[PDB]
Amino acid sequence: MKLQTTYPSNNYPIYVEHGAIKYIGTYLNQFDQSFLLIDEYVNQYFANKFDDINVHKVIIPAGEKTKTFEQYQETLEYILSHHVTRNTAIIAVGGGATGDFAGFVAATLLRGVHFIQVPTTILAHDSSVGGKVGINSKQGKNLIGAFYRPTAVIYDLDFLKTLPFKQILSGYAEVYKHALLNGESATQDIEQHFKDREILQSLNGMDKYIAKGIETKLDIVVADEKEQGVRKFLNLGHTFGHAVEYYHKIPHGHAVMVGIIYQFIVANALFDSKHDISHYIQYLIQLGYPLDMYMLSDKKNDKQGVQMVLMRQFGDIVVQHVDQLTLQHACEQLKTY
Ligand SMILES: NC(=O)c1ccc[n+]([C@@H]2O[C@H](COP(=O)([O-])OP(=O)(O)OC[C@H]3O[C@@H](n4cnc5c(N)ncnc54)[C@H](O)[C@@H]3O)[C@@H](O)[C@H]2O)c1
Ligand SMILES: O=C(O)[C@]1(O)C[C@H](CP(=O)(O)O)[C@@H](O)[C@H](O)C1
Ligand SMILES: [Zn+2]
């Protein structure tokens, strides 16, 4: 399969399929050079699958550890010491952390070079699309970065076959977030397929729901590309979730699930949406989520206070200030579990 962006122009393709690693060469021989940035662990995993390929390998730290100024400066300096030109290209081979980072390198290298997204994780079906890239500050998640449409996104589904469950759980929180944004329809549907840990962990039919999720975000970002409207909805649970992640050092996805339950509660203490908190808590339990596990600076805020993406009812998403009280009780109400 192959989806694509629908902007007036300057649009990139999104090749999603098993073995899509093949479409890489059909771009390469058009760039001066190509600096393939790959996650340290991912390298170990697929060091051989990329030997087919003007291309120079750059091994970057494992996951979330690569998104720092230090690593940003280092990586930039190293690449510039290779007399690169504007017609060079960065090939992000790894997960969201790796793509965010490399994507920021390629966005700033000479005010912008060519960017190729090669997502290898489930959560990366989200991170690889949308054009958001960046690193972290001693202040929080994603405070420095930019919007840089990659030249192309090449998603080879064969990459998933090696993800431990922890990452399947982390990444599924995103496949689920998107279904939630598809209203009560695509939701109860996905819950009815991935009903337990076994089906999830087994990745059966995951392909179908990953494409469903890319297809979903692809509409939002084509629409509100600079997050000045509906793209704000994608921050569902990232309010409490970006705070939770950068604080317990738990998988991003895990923290998104928690910000999602949290968001439902805050929606009920405010809109009395009559959300079945106990329903979502058991779904997390049946899936295998680890039930054992700042917001004043998020990117949907203003000089007034907090700003959450609350669901009042399926197909009725809002965004609005929330007193730390409704939050104070929401994070004690969520303690009930
Ligand atoms: N629009 C955006 O810019 C955007 C959207 C969503 C999330 N994110 C970012 O994405 C990151 C979280 O996503 P992530 O979990 O995919 O990142 P990640 O790079 O941290 O990957 C998670 C872990 O899986 C390993 N891994 C990667 N490929 C693998 C594979 N195929 N098999 C086995 N293990 C593999 C990595 O080494 C790492 O330890 C965060 O940094 C988050 O802020 C960015
Ligand atoms: O616009 C997007 O692509 C996102 O809202 C971007 C956020 C990152 P941000 O909240 O740091 O922008 C990401 O976590 C979420 O899954 C989707
Ligand atoms: Zn996310």
Swiss-Prot record:
It holds the Pfam family DHQS_C. Pathway: Metabolic intermediate biosynthesis; chorismate biosynthesis; chorismate from D-erythrose 4-phosphate and phosphoenolpyruvate: step 2/7. Keywords: Amino-acid biosynthesis, Aromatic amino acid biosynthesis, Cobalt, Cytoplasm, Lyase, Metal-binding, NAD, Nucleotide-binding, Zinc. Its main location: cytoplasm. Zn(2+) binds at residues 174, 238, 252. The keyword NADP does not apply. InterPro entries: Dehydroquinate_synthase, DHQ_synth_AroB, DHQ_synth_fam, DHQS/DOIS_N, DHQS_C. Binds 1 divalent metal cation per subunit. Can use either Co(2+) or Zn(2+). The keyword Plastid does not apply. Its cofactor is NAD(+); Co(2+); Zn(2+). Its EC number is 4.2.3.4. This is 3-dehydroquinate synthase. The gene is aroB.
